Amino acid sequence: GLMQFTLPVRLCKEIELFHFDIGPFENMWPGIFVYMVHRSCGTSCFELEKLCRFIMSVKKNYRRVPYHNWKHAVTVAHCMYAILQNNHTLFTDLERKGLLIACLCHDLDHRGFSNSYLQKFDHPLAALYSTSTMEQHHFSQTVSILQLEGHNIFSTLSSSEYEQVLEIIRKAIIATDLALYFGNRKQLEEMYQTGSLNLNNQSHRDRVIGLMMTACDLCSVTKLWPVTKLTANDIYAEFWAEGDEMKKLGIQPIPMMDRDKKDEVPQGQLGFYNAVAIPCYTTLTQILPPTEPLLKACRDNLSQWEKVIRGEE
Numbered sequence: 001g002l003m004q005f006t007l008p009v010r011l012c013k014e015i016e017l018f019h020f021d022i023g024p025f026e027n028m029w030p031g032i033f034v035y036m037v038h039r040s041c042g043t044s045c046f047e048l049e050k051l052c053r054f055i056m057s058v059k060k061n062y063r064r065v066p067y068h069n070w071k072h073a074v075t076v077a078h079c080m081y082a083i084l085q086n087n088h089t090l091f092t093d094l095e096r097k098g099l100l101i102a103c104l105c106h107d108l109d110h111r112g113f114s115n116s117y118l119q120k121f122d123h124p125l126a127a128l129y130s131t132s133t134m135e136q137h138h139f140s141q142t143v144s145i146l147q148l149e150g151h152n153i154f155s156t157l158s159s160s161e162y163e164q165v166l167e168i169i170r171k172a173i174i175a176t177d178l179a180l181y182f183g184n185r186k187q188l189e190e191m192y193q194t195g196s197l198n199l200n201n202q203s204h205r206d207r208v209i210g211l212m213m214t215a216c217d218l219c220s221v222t223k224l225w226p227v228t229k230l231t232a233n234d235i236y237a238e239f240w241a242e243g244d245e246m247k248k249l250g251i252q253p254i255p256m257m258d259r260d261k262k263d264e265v266p267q268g269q270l271g272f273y274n275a276v277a278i279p280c281y282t283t284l285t286q287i288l289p290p291t292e293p294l295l296k297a298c299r300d301n302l303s304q305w306e307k308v309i310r311g312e313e
């Protein structure tokens with residue numbers, strides 16, 4: 001009950017900002033997660049012992065990949081923490097619980113390869129789950145860990161509440177399949193512009209939560225430029241590895257995954273900003289006005305990639 005988590009002064013103040021970087025000290029990240037749960041959810045939300053064990057079993061189930069790793073998980077959960085803290089009254093006790101856990105679990109057991117590559121490889125997972133292949137696997141790994149002895153962090157919920165939170169988690173993890181993002185954001189754009197967006201409508205809440213998941217997943221593009229630039233190295237380290245595995249299947253990869261084409265990266269980034277990132281944060285800011293600092297930072301990074309292209313860096 002009375003056993004609070006306390007960060008050092010700099011992290012105490014900066015953890016509240018959208019552009020917070022969790023740091024290189026891996027042993028501090030569990031603690032930073034529990035801190036976020038306690039302030040976002042309460043000190044009564046989860047049994048500490050159950051939560052600690054759960055977190056450690058989650059960490060162990062992320063692989064040693066350049067980008068889709070334990071650090072990405074914690075980084076996505078922080079961006080959701082920042083959203084939820086800036087939007088106190090909008091979300092239910094169940095949603096706050098579920099969404100931090102969904103963010104921590106969203107890339108469980110990622111091998112660093114796209115849905116596309118699994119399907120072209122003919123991976124077993126592409127037979128078990130024909131769409132959102134990796135995301136259905138992430139949800140299936142999340143249920144696994146929740147079902148280890150001592151790892152049921154939701155044990156104090158009723159049967160029906162437990163079913164709702166696992167449905168919040170299922171939808172939130174599926175929503176991280178970027179292929180689903182474009183149509184979701186368009187639906188949200190019309191609903192907002194025609195003033196029919198209704199947050200008591202559950203089908204509507206699910207779409208807004210979907211877009212929050214995309215926002216949190218892409219939050220690399222919302223950091224300060226030195227963080228954004230160095231994070232791009234880890235992302236393209238996985239893209240080029242996949243490119244290499246495509247070329248082993250006898251398939252020319254897209255330029256995004258071809259290391260021979262590292263020259264076209266700065267133009268590649270502008271398209272991403274213009275086609276995904278800026279639209280994602282713009283729509284998020286219309287629906288949830290206090291998430292504007294995400295759109296501001298993303299625009300700052302677009303300007304930096306236009307300077308790279310101009311050779312101002």
Ligand SMILES: Cn1cc(-c2ccncc2)c(C(=O)N[C@@H]2CCN(c3ccc(Cl)cn3)C2)n1
Nearest residue numbers: 178220221232235255256261264265268269272
């Ligand atoms: C799934 N996802 C996440 C990210 C992400 C996230 C955070 N920082 C950066 C990229 C991207 C992403 O950058 N992808 C675009 C899509 C096209 N692309 C090209 C295209 C041609 C060349 Cl030569 C180089 N990159 C970059 N895609």
Ligand SMILES: [Mg+2]
Nearest residue numbers: 106107134176
């Ligand atoms: Mg993913």
Ligand SMILES: [Zn+2]
Nearest residue numbers: 072106107217
């Ligand atoms: Zn992710």
